[PDB]
Design a protein around this nucleic acid. Structure first.
Lengths: 142, 138
DNA sequence: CGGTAATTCT
DNA sequence: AGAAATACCG
């Protein structure tokens, strides 16, 4: 079926944009391939948005094109989770982006996709299974 | 459509009508149809047996219990007719007053049970179902 | 962030 | 079952 990871905004929208290229967690995951991204229920403050955008200007340049909305509580899109590296192997295998994450495990993401219509959703911990009908309509929407 | 997640084996007993109230620590304004989902917590066979004995005391020896108590799924619905404090519970329902000592007691009527139990992930308190999940529930 | 019969897994 | 988690709501 469809497997999903819930992420706090404004990080989540950066992930489905391809602006944020890794996701850092304290725990390891065997999951590979298509990983759906849902924003958690957390509402980001305007400060949180501007501070995160500033940090990514340091990391990816002044001409990063950020999203104009960071909606919470919805399915945003998907990435492909190609690898889950320890922090040590992250630095060694990705020294050009090693600075994007200080977490114990680092989810290596490619092929970011962003949905045009974001389906409302209530998330779960870690990587969890989408209800089959939201998943179906979600891959249709793409 | 609104849902309440309940631990097995209490959850299936609610949709059976065997369990007639749900006691919680908190008040809810919700009235009318309330869907009951089993939480993901699995009861031991021992716990199921002890609970069934308890409900044989309260409802008779020939209570027809469900044959399984599946976890993590939509089970059915009740009508939530009232949410009483423990006092108003003792006053208005003194014949089942012993069935719950909780700060608030949800009075449940018209229990209905689905034939196929749809798997579902719950949320705390009374939470809103997806309208299409709500559709298929009938 | 605390309250919650949320869900996950050794 | 009891830990654990970017669960959810207020």
């Amino acid at each position: 079926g469809g497997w999903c990871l819930s992420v706090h905004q404004p990080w989540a929208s950066l992930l489905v944009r391809g602006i944020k290229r890794v996701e850092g967690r304290s725990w390891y995951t065997p999951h590979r391939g298509r990983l759906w991204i849902a924003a958690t229920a957390k509402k980001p403050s305007p400060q949180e948005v501007s501070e995160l955008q500033a940090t990514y200007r340091l990391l990816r340049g002044k001409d990063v094109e950020f999203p104009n909305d960071y909606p919470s509580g919805c399915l945003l899109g998907c990435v492909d989770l190609i690898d889950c590296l320890s922090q040590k192997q992250f630095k060694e295998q990705f020294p050009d982006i090693s600075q994007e994450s200080d977490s114990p495990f680092v989810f290596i993401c490619k092929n970011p996709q962003e949905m045009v219509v974001k389906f409302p959703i209530k998330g779960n911990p870690k990587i969890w299974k989408l209800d089959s009908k939201i998943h179906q309509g979600a891959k249709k929407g793409l």
